[PDB]
Every structure is written in structure tokens, then in C-alpha cells.
Amino acid sequence: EISMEQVSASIGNFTVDLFNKLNETNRDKNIFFSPWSISSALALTYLAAKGSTAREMAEVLHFTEAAENIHSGFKELLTAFNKPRNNYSLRSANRIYVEKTYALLPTYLQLSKKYYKAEPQKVNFKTAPEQSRKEINTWVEKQTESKIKNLLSSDDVKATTRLILVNAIYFKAEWEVKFQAEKTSIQPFRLSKNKSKPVKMMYMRDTFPVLIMEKMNFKMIELPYVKRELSMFILLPDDIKDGTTGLEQLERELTYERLSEWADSKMMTETLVDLHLPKFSLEDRIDLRDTLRNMGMTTAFTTNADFRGMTDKKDLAISKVIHQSFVAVDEKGTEAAAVLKFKVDHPFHFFIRHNKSKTILFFGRFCCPVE
């Protein structure tokens, strides 16, 4: 209803903040994550949190400024994203793994099942961390169509471990207008002004929604997936006018109010585009603990955690929050194939949105070819 506009708003907001915490750390590497996967998975743990443990989560996740409405909107976004006739696949693997000796509460089990069609699993961390680890990595792999194995490493599961919030996601979708295999060729992608790197550069001449933000020195394109249910927006700085990537201005002015304003700007108009879009497969994996504690989520990770929404006693803390998303940008879309100049050969911000509800599913900055 409107219950799901809040969840979408909180995500887009969560997105930028999460980007900003990461960006200040590493200014020279690719930043890519699924804010929907991350947020929807912490919602599982927020559901089980009490007091300021619960409050710190709701505040960083943007569920409140200073509950029911949030879980309700999440359910209906999860319901919408998992329709059968959808022209796109979100192979999502959100689950919390709790130690076998913790007495879980029935109410939490039926509330978790209702809003998320997900429920807490009991593994023996205490005397069999590896059997638990392999069991989790196997589930995460079977949920993400084999695309994400070994989510948790050996150093992530110990006899200590009490709770693991895994959250992975594999993206499958096809372009509305897809590139032609024969027109993909090797071309330089400019990292800096001075340094560049070759990449398989895809190309097509076709019409797309394009916004020309002259005052802010960039241009943005909308590349719809099939039926335009999902789209990927790409924000290109007019050029590299920086000591590094060329995005230093966009990041120093990044905002969600702005982001969404440009996304649906009536000033965005159909345009015939000479489009050059590099192939890339991003499989970023992030251990979110410290990153979340930096964003304001402290208590959930301490001995003072209060997750008595799921357990009877105040002895449960989050141990690991491990995220990983796999997204490819290829000729057909997520898979490979068998007049305004829009040449993407310099660092760019991008995001895959679910158009109807305006939920950002993926967001990142591509600057730095992994190959």
C-alpha cells in the first residue's frame, strides 16, 4: 500500500548512507551492494530486537527517524518481486542461522514466516561449526542458482558463533533492447585521466530516457529490462574532471531525494543514443559488521544485545552479517549473447531499480575493471 513506499524510501536512503560509509574507506575500488537484500535481511533481525538494540537498527535502516508498517511493506515488496509472471529473477538468500541451544519463540517463528517467508534455522555452532558452515554455504548456493558458493569462509564460523545473518542475491534479467554480440569489441576504459584499461565494450544505436543535468556536470540514462519492470540507471560525469575517477563531485553531492528526482524527472526525455556500455560481472562480498557499527548499529553486536523477540533470555548477539551480490552487465542483460553520444568509458554510478515501487535493488560505483 503506502506501507511499501516507506520501505522503498528507507532503502534508497539506506543506500546512500551505506555508500557513503564505504566510499570514505576505499576511494579507488568498486563499490557494489544490494541495499534491498541487506535491508530486507536485517529486517529479519530487527523483527527479533528489543529496546535500543531494535532502535539503532530502525534508525540506520531508516525504519524510523527517532515497526508494523515496515514489516508490512517488506512483505508486499517481497510478494511483488517474487510474482510468477515477472520478467526478471531475484534469487535471494536471506536467512538467520542461530545456535541449536537457543530456545526460539514460537510467535517470532510465525511472524517471521508471515512477512518474510523466512525462518531462523538451528545449527550446532558450538561443537560443529564447519558442518554448520558447509550447511549454510550449501543453502546459499542452492538459493542463488549455484552462482554464490562459499559465502562464509572458515574464519567466519567458530565454536563462539551464535548468530549468522546471511544475505546473498543473484540477479537474472533481460534487456528491453539488447546489444548485438557482433558489435561488442575491445576498447579502453579510462580509470584516471592518465591511466586506462581495456574492457569488452558493448554498443548499440537506440532510443532511451536521458536526463541532461548541465548545472551538475553529468548525464543519466535509463536502460529498461523487459517490459520496463526493472531498469538500470547510469550516471556519467560529463567527463573526467578530477584528480581520480571524475565522480568526486557526484559523490560529494549524492542524495536520495536528488537520485529519485532525476530518475523520474519530467526533464528526462526519449533520446536516440550512441551507447557504449562495458561488460562487467560484479560479485562483491561484504562482511557488514564494522560497517554497520560505524553507521550507528552498536548494541546488536555486543553482549548487551537484546533479541528477546526470538529468544527467552538476553544472551543472543549478532556474530556475522555477510552480504554478497552477483550482477552481470552483458549483451542480453545478465547473460551474454550467442544522435547524442553516450560513451561509458569512465567511472560511473549506477543502480537497478524496481520501477513501480521505486525500490533500489542494486547500487554501486563502477570505476575500476576487476578483470
Tab-separated table of C-alpha atoms in Angstrom:
chain	number	residue	atom	x	y	z
A	1	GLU	CA	0.000	0.000	0.000
A	2	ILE	CA	1.765	3.111	1.305
A	3	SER	CA	3.303	0.607	3.742
A	4	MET	CA	5.690	-0.290	0.943
A	5	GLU	CA	6.572	3.273	-0.126
A	6	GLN	CA	8.195	3.736	3.281
A	7	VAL	CA	10.226	0.542	2.886
A	8	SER	CA	11.348	1.746	-0.591
A	9	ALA	CA	12.139	5.242	0.777
A	10	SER	CA	14.092	3.769	3.711
A	11	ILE	CA	16.069	1.614	1.237
A	12	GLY	CA	17.042	4.469	-1.123
A	13	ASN	CA	18.023	6.407	1.975
A	14	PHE	CA	19.796	3.417	3.480
A	15	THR	CA	21.553	3.039	0.058
A	16	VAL	CA	23.284	6.448	0.011
A	17	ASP	CA	24.313	6.261	3.670
A	18	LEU	CA	25.725	2.769	3.152
A	19	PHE	CA	27.524	4.029	0.048
A	20	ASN	CA	28.916	6.994	1.982
A	21	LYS	CA	30.332	4.811	4.789
A	22	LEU	CA	32.021	2.530	2.262
A	23	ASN	CA	33.207	5.333	-0.072
A	24	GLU	CA	35.162	7.110	2.696
A	25	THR	CA	37.062	3.870	3.279
A	26	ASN	CA	38.088	2.876	-0.271
A	27	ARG	CA	38.066	5.673	-2.866
A	28	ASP	CA	39.827	3.537	-5.510
A	29	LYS	CA	37.889	0.265	-5.719
A	30	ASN	CA	34.448	-0.750	-6.992
A	31	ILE	CA	31.596	-0.320	-4.525
A	32	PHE	CA	28.640	-2.572	-5.273
A	33	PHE	CA	25.937	-3.931	-2.979
A	34	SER	CA	22.249	-4.826	-2.852
A	35	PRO	CA	20.544	-2.410	-0.436
A	36	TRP	CA	17.291	-4.373	-0.813
A	37	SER	CA	18.974	-7.682	0.072
A	38	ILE	CA	20.848	-6.115	3.016
A	39	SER	CA	17.890	-4.166	4.382
A	40	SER	CA	15.361	-6.991	3.904
A	41	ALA	CA	17.704	-9.353	5.783
A	42	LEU	CA	18.401	-7.043	8.738
A	43	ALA	CA	14.634	-6.717	8.946
A	44	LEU	CA	14.660	-10.380	9.991
A	45	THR	CA	16.914	-9.489	12.934
A	46	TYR	CA	15.157	-6.160	13.662
A	47	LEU	CA	11.982	-8.221	13.969
A	48	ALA	CA	13.671	-10.071	16.865
A	49	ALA	CA	15.226	-6.989	18.545
A	50	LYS	CA	14.037	-5.132	21.672
A	51	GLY	CA	14.903	-1.728	23.247
A	52	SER	CA	17.830	0.293	21.865
A	53	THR	CA	19.170	-2.787	20.028
A	54	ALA	CA	15.987	-2.545	17.936
A	55	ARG	CA	16.092	1.262	17.831
A	56	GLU	CA	19.628	1.571	16.474
A	57	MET	CA	18.660	-0.775	13.635
A	58	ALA	CA	15.422	1.054	12.759
A	59	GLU	CA	17.396	4.316	12.741
A	60	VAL	CA	20.300	3.321	10.446
A	61	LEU	CA	17.987	1.232	8.223
A	62	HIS	CA	15.638	4.253	8.179
A	63	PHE	CA	12.611	2.324	9.509
A	64	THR	CA	12.031	5.282	11.895
A	65	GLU	CA	13.632	8.707	12.410
A	66	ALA	CA	13.509	8.777	16.217
A	67	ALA	CA	7.744	-1.262	13.108
A	68	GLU	CA	4.474	-2.822	11.844
A	69	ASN	CA	4.342	-0.537	8.815
A	70	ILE	CA	7.867	-1.639	7.798
A	71	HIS	CA	7.356	-5.424	8.072
A	72	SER	CA	4.033	-4.993	6.222
A	73	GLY	CA	5.618	-3.119	3.299
A	74	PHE	CA	8.541	-5.549	3.127
A	75	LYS	CA	6.129	-8.497	2.844
A	76	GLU	CA	4.275	-6.820	-0.034
A	77	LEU	CA	7.563	-5.938	-1.800
A	78	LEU	CA	8.818	-9.469	-1.342
A	79	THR	CA	5.400	-10.642	-2.634
A	80	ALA	CA	5.669	-8.312	-5.653
A	81	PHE	CA	9.279	-9.210	-6.522
A	82	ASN	CA	8.525	-12.921	-6.436
A	83	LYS	CA	5.462	-12.889	-8.739
A	84	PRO	CA	5.488	-15.720	-11.297
A	85	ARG	CA	4.942	-13.608	-14.457
A	86	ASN	CA	7.846	-11.293	-13.591
A	87	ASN	CA	10.338	-10.673	-16.357
A	88	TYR	CA	13.292	-10.806	-14.012
A	89	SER	CA	14.664	-13.035	-11.301
A	90	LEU	CA	15.834	-12.117	-7.825
A	91	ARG	CA	17.427	-15.298	-6.483
A	92	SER	CA	17.653	-14.026	-2.909
A	93	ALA	CA	19.175	-15.956	0.043
A	94	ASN	CA	18.203	-14.112	3.266
A	95	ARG	CA	18.260	-16.199	6.440
A	96	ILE	CA	19.406	-16.053	10.034
A	97	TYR	CA	21.297	-19.047	11.443
A	98	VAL	CA	21.061	-19.405	15.231
A	99	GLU	CA	22.870	-21.788	17.659
A	100	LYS	CA	20.997	-25.044	18.358
A	101	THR	CA	20.868	-24.441	22.180
A	102	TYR	CA	18.868	-21.204	21.961
A	103	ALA	CA	15.154	-21.516	22.661
A	104	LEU	CA	13.434	-19.638	19.847
A	105	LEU	CA	9.989	-18.087	20.448
A	106	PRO	CA	7.001	-19.515	18.520
A	107	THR	CA	5.491	-16.065	17.929
A	108	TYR	CA	8.681	-14.937	16.210
A	109	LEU	CA	8.588	-18.108	14.107
A	110	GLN	CA	5.041	-17.317	12.853
A	111	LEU	CA	5.658	-13.562	12.433
A	112	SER	CA	8.876	-14.255	10.522
A	113	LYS	CA	7.068	-16.788	8.308
A	114	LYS	CA	4.265	-14.298	7.531
A	115	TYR	CA	6.168	-11.163	6.480
A	116	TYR	CA	9.277	-12.782	5.048
A	117	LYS	CA	8.531	-16.398	4.131
A	118	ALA	CA	11.835	-16.960	6.003
A	119	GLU	CA	12.501	-18.600	9.378
A	120	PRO	CA	15.522	-18.977	11.734
A	121	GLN	CA	17.483	-22.229	11.344
A	122	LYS	CA	19.090	-24.075	14.254
A	123	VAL	CA	22.597	-25.373	13.593
A	124	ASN	CA	25.093	-26.731	16.121
A	125	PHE	CA	27.693	-23.930	16.070
A	126	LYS	CA	29.047	-24.964	19.498
A	127	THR	CA	30.561	-28.379	18.680
A	128	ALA	CA	30.264	-28.456	14.851
A	129	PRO	CA	30.998	-25.008	13.318
A	130	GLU	CA	32.202	-26.499	9.964
A	131	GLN	CA	29.179	-28.793	9.499
A	132	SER	CA	27.061	-25.673	10.138
A	133	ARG	CA	29.220	-23.603	7.757
A	134	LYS	CA	29.059	-26.089	4.866
A	135	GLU	CA	25.316	-26.494	5.500
A	136	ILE	CA	24.791	-22.703	5.258
A	137	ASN	CA	27.054	-22.256	2.189
A	138	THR	CA	25.109	-25.092	0.503
A	139	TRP	CA	21.724	-23.432	1.114
A	140	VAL	CA	23.042	-20.019	-0.019
A	141	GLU	CA	24.377	-21.705	-3.154
A	142	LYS	CA	21.132	-23.579	-3.968
A	143	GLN	CA	19.064	-20.411	-3.462
A	144	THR	CA	21.324	-18.302	-5.733
A	145	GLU	CA	21.253	-20.845	-8.612
A	146	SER	CA	24.767	-22.091	-7.745
A	147	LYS	CA	26.109	-18.596	-8.512
A	148	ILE	CA	27.263	-17.984	-4.910
A	149	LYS	CA	29.111	-20.810	-3.141
A	150	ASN	CA	31.393	-20.440	-0.067
A	151	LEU	CA	29.589	-17.313	1.229
A	152	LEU	CA	31.003	-17.941	4.710
A	153	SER	CA	34.729	-18.649	4.991
A	154	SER	CA	36.392	-20.918	7.586
A	155	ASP	CA	37.255	-17.873	9.709
A	156	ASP	CA	33.569	-16.799	9.812
A	157	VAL	CA	32.262	-19.817	11.851
A	158	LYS	CA	33.718	-20.745	15.245
A	159	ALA	CA	32.526	-22.518	18.406
A	160	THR	CA	31.814	-18.976	19.615
A	161	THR	CA	29.400	-18.084	16.781
A	162	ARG	CA	25.823	-17.623	17.988
A	163	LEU	CA	24.054	-15.893	15.110
A	164	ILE	CA	24.782	-15.526	11.400
A	165	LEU	CA	22.687	-13.249	9.249
A	166	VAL	CA	23.481	-14.377	5.697
A	167	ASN	CA	22.175	-12.279	2.863
A	168	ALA	CA	23.133	-13.106	-0.722
A	169	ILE	CA	21.426	-12.305	-4.042
A	170	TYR	CA	21.733	-13.430	-7.698
A	171	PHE	CA	20.232	-11.252	-10.426
A	172	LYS	CA	18.681	-12.585	-13.666
A	173	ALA	CA	17.099	-10.187	-16.160
A	174	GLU	CA	16.931	-9.438	-19.873
A	175	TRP	CA	17.298	-6.053	-21.626
A	176	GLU	CA	14.273	-4.411	-23.308
A	177	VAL	CA	16.561	-3.647	-26.213
A	178	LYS	CA	19.612	-5.900	-26.041
A	179	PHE	CA	23.061	-5.377	-27.535
A	180	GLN	CA	24.288	-7.230	-30.597
A	181	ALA	CA	27.046	-9.766	-29.975
A	182	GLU	CA	28.760	-8.858	-33.251
A	183	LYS	CA	29.083	-5.177	-32.217
A	184	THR	CA	30.912	-5.814	-28.927
A	185	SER	CA	34.648	-5.006	-29.287
A	186	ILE	CA	37.703	-4.287	-27.102
A	187	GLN	CA	38.024	-0.610	-26.103
A	188	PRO	CA	39.860	1.498	-23.499
A	189	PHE	CA	38.006	2.352	-20.263
A	190	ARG	CA	39.555	5.366	-18.540
A	191	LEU	CA	40.286	4.775	-14.837
A	192	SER	CA	42.053	8.111	-14.378
A	193	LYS	CA	42.780	10.853	-16.895
A	194	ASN	CA	46.282	9.394	-17.264
A	195	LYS	CA	45.628	5.657	-16.890
A	196	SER	CA	43.144	3.449	-18.794
A	197	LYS	CA	42.285	-0.247	-19.181
A	198	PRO	CA	40.755	-2.332	-21.966
A	199	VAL	CA	37.330	-3.918	-21.492
A	200	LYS	CA	34.850	-5.624	-23.824
A	201	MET	CA	32.773	-2.580	-24.776
A	202	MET	CA	29.213	-3.293	-25.942
A	203	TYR	CA	27.422	-0.971	-28.361
A	204	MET	CA	24.050	-0.113	-29.918
A	205	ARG	CA	22.304	2.834	-31.575
A	206	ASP	CA	18.879	3.147	-29.975
A	207	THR	CA	16.434	5.438	-28.081
A	208	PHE	CA	16.456	5.761	-24.261
A	209	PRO	CA	15.218	8.083	-21.465
A	210	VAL	CA	18.058	10.557	-20.887
A	211	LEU	CA	18.433	13.459	-18.449
A	212	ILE	CA	20.971	16.206	-19.253
A	213	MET	CA	21.979	17.770	-15.900
A	214	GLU	CA	24.191	20.655	-17.114
A	215	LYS	CA	24.296	22.514	-13.771
A	216	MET	CA	25.719	19.420	-12.038
A	217	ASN	CA	28.036	18.287	-14.870
A	218	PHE	CA	26.631	14.827	-15.825
A	219	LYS	CA	24.106	12.923	-17.995
A	220	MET	CA	21.888	9.997	-16.971
A	221	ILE	CA	20.379	7.147	-18.963
A	222	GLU	CA	17.579	4.685	-18.250
A	223	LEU	CA	18.121	1.197	-19.628
A	224	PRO	CA	14.905	-0.830	-19.084
A	225	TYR	CA	14.864	-4.566	-18.675
A	226	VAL	CA	11.900	-6.463	-20.226
A	227	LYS	CA	8.532	-4.666	-20.065
A	228	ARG	CA	10.461	-1.981	-18.134
A	229	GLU	CA	9.551	-3.667	-14.824
A	230	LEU	CA	13.150	-3.139	-13.795
A	231	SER	CA	15.654	-0.565	-15.073
A	232	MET	CA	19.308	0.275	-14.643
A	233	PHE	CA	20.152	3.956	-14.369
A	234	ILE	CA	23.697	5.094	-15.194
A	235	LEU	CA	25.021	8.486	-14.083
A	236	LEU	CA	28.010	9.607	-16.184
A	237	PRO	CA	30.032	12.682	-15.267
A	238	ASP	CA	30.181	14.786	-18.446
A	239	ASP	CA	33.854	13.766	-18.349
A	240	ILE	CA	36.822	13.065	-16.061
A	241	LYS	CA	37.345	16.483	-14.426
A	242	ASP	CA	39.008	15.015	-11.313
A	243	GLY	CA	42.346	14.008	-9.819
A	244	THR	CA	40.981	10.466	-9.833
A	245	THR	CA	37.688	8.985	-11.149
A	246	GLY	CA	35.600	12.002	-12.204
A	247	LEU	CA	32.826	11.106	-9.753
A	248	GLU	CA	34.295	13.171	-6.893
A	249	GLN	CA	31.576	15.806	-7.491
A	250	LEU	CA	28.621	13.393	-7.744
A	251	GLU	CA	29.607	11.561	-4.570
A	252	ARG	CA	30.252	14.847	-2.740
A	253	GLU	CA	26.642	15.753	-3.622
A	254	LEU	CA	24.962	12.342	-3.526
A	255	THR	CA	21.445	12.377	-2.089
A	256	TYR	CA	18.390	10.085	-2.333
A	257	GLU	CA	15.926	12.947	-2.783
A	258	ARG	CA	18.049	14.038	-5.760
A	259	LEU	CA	18.623	10.486	-7.020
A	260	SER	CA	14.931	9.707	-7.275
A	261	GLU	CA	14.195	13.242	-8.556
A	262	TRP	CA	16.431	12.657	-11.560
A	263	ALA	CA	15.139	9.081	-12.013
A	264	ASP	CA	11.590	10.311	-12.708
A	265	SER	CA	12.469	13.851	-13.818
A	266	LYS	CA	9.977	15.096	-16.399
A	267	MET	CA	13.187	16.693	-17.723
A	268	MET	CA	14.251	13.155	-18.691
A	269	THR	CA	13.224	12.518	-22.271
A	270	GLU	CA	13.447	9.861	-25.016
A	271	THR	CA	16.677	10.265	-26.966
A	272	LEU	CA	18.469	8.418	-29.750
A	273	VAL	CA	21.690	7.319	-28.110
A	274	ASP	CA	25.027	6.146	-29.486
A	275	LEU	CA	25.526	3.887	-26.444
A	276	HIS	CA	28.806	2.304	-25.300
A	277	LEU	CA	28.357	0.185	-22.169
A	278	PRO	CA	31.235	-2.009	-20.854
A	279	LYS	CA	30.694	-5.660	-19.967
A	280	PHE	CA	31.350	-6.392	-16.281
A	281	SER	CA	30.439	-9.003	-13.684
A	282	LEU	CA	30.380	-7.775	-10.101
A	283	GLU	CA	30.323	-10.308	-7.292
A	284	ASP	CA	31.167	-8.082	-4.327
A	285	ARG	CA	31.044	-9.842	-0.924
A	286	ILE	CA	30.854	-7.699	2.207
A	287	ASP	CA	31.276	-8.591	5.890
A	288	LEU	CA	28.998	-5.821	7.182
A	289	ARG	CA	29.707	-5.882	10.942
A	290	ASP	CA	32.102	-2.954	11.469
A	291	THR	CA	30.458	-1.056	8.611
A	292	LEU	CA	27.090	-1.282	10.413
A	293	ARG	CA	28.572	-0.384	13.823
A	294	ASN	CA	30.032	2.689	12.112
A	295	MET	CA	26.618	3.584	10.746
A	296	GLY	CA	25.225	3.545	14.314
A	297	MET	CA	24.259	-0.088	14.916
A	298	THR	CA	26.244	-0.817	18.119
A	299	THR	CA	24.259	-2.871	20.669
A	300	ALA	CA	23.094	-5.667	18.319
A	301	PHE	CA	26.764	-6.772	18.108
A	302	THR	CA	27.584	-6.579	21.841
A	303	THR	CA	26.949	-8.808	24.879
A	304	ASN	CA	24.257	-6.213	25.649
A	305	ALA	CA	22.201	-7.131	22.540
A	306	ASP	CA	18.506	-7.653	23.087
A	307	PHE	CA	16.965	-10.134	20.684
A	308	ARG	CA	14.252	-11.354	23.065
A	309	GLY	CA	11.733	-11.174	20.237
A	310	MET	CA	13.206	-14.530	19.152
A	311	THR	CA	14.778	-15.940	22.389
A	312	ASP	CA	13.685	-16.158	26.022
A	313	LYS	CA	16.917	-14.792	27.578
A	314	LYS	CA	19.153	-11.742	26.925
A	315	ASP	CA	22.194	-13.773	25.805
A	316	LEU	CA	21.991	-13.530	21.995
A	317	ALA	CA	24.179	-11.202	19.895
A	318	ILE	CA	24.816	-10.902	16.164
A	319	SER	CA	28.103	-12.565	15.249
A	320	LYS	CA	28.337	-12.175	11.470
A	321	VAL	CA	26.489	-10.147	8.855
A	322	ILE	CA	27.752	-11.379	5.493
A	323	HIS	CA	26.442	-9.915	2.244
A	324	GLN	CA	27.169	-10.839	-1.370
A	325	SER	CA	25.531	-9.961	-4.673
A	326	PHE	CA	26.232	-11.213	-8.194
A	327	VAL	CA	25.227	-8.974	-11.082
A	328	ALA	CA	26.432	-9.021	-14.651
A	329	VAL	CA	26.030	-6.354	-17.319
A	330	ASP	CA	26.173	-8.065	-20.655
A	331	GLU	CA	24.615	-8.161	-24.145
A	332	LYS	CA	21.269	-9.821	-23.318
A	333	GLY	CA	21.316	-8.214	-19.843
A	334	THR	CA	22.572	-10.511	-17.124
A	335	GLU	CA	23.656	-13.080	-19.760
A	336	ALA	CA	25.881	-12.971	-22.879
A	337	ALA	CA	24.566	-13.290	-26.471
A	338	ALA	CA	25.131	-16.183	-28.932
A	339	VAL	CA	22.298	11.367	-32.138
A	340	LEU	CA	23.668	12.007	-28.639
A	341	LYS	CA	26.965	10.220	-27.948
A	342	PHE	CA	26.638	8.257	-24.676
A	343	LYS	CA	30.046	6.606	-24.269
A	344	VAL	CA	30.525	4.928	-20.920
A	345	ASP	CA	34.337	4.692	-20.769
A	346	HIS	CA	34.914	6.434	-17.440
A	347	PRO	CA	33.823	5.731	-13.835
A	348	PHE	CA	30.075	5.800	-13.278
A	349	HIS	CA	27.430	5.467	-10.599
A	350	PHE	CA	24.555	3.101	-11.358
A	351	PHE	CA	21.564	1.300	-9.854
A	352	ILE	CA	18.984	-1.317	-10.752
A	353	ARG	CA	15.553	-0.105	-9.650
A	354	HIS	CA	12.153	-1.774	-9.438
A	355	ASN	CA	10.193	0.903	-11.317
A	356	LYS	CA	6.610	0.543	-9.987
A	357	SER	CA	7.606	0.806	-6.299
A	358	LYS	CA	10.841	2.786	-6.909
A	359	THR	CA	12.883	0.353	-4.816
A	360	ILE	CA	16.621	0.388	-5.437
A	361	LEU	CA	17.626	-3.290	-5.722
A	362	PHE	CA	21.333	-2.747	-6.532
A	363	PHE	CA	23.608	0.271	-6.310
A	364	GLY	CA	27.295	0.886	-6.831
A	365	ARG	CA	30.074	2.836	-8.449
A	366	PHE	CA	31.868	1.155	-11.318
A	367	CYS	CA	35.260	2.803	-11.798
A	368	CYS	CA	37.701	0.038	-11.731
A	369	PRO	CA	37.502	-3.034	-14.089
A	370	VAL	CA	38.152	-6.182	-11.996
A	371	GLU	CA	39.493	-8.218	-14.934
